[PDB]
Amino acid sequence: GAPATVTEQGEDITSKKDRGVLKIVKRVGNGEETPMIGDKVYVHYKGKLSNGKKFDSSHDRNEPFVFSLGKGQVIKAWDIGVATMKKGEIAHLLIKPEYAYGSAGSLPKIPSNATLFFEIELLDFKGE
């Protein structure tokens, strides 16, 4: 599956280099500029738990997911991950619990010490 491929070939984009966030670019973006902290960011995504028991896509809500990058409004893996993306890029991220919902989880939606997988498309990003 795609998460296997990420565990196998994916780049470790953490600072501590602890493999808590692994990344593959699946479709290359355009431009050279990757969003700065504070930028308003527009994405589509598809997410799932490694346990295979919960899925979630922005498309289900029928609109872009929108957030301010680096302002803690998403899990840390997204702040780190999306900051590496270009306009038009699609990436896969595999995420250990320390960069997602930790040992507490977010019950019952995200269980304790869960690993997450996302496919993310970066649509646009604007200066605040």
Ligand X SMILES: COc1cc2cc(OC)c1OCCCCCCOC(=O)[C@@H]1CCCCN1C(=O)[C@H]2C1CCCCC1
Least spacing, CB of residue 9 vs ligand X, in Å: 22
Least spacing, CB of residue 54 vs ligand X, in Å: 5
Q: Is 18 a catalytic residue?
A: no
Q: Do the Cβ atoms of 7 and 94 come closer than 8 Å?
A: yes
Considering only residues 47 to 106 of the shown chain, the ones binding ligand X according to CB under 6 A are 47-49, 54, 56, 65, 74-75, 78, 106
Residue 109 touches ligand X, criterion: CB under 6 A:
yes
Q: Which residues bind ligand X (CB under 6 A)?
A: 45, 47-49, 54, 56, 65, 74-75, 78, 106, 109-110, 116
**Which residues carry out catalysis?**
45, 55-56, 75, 101, 118
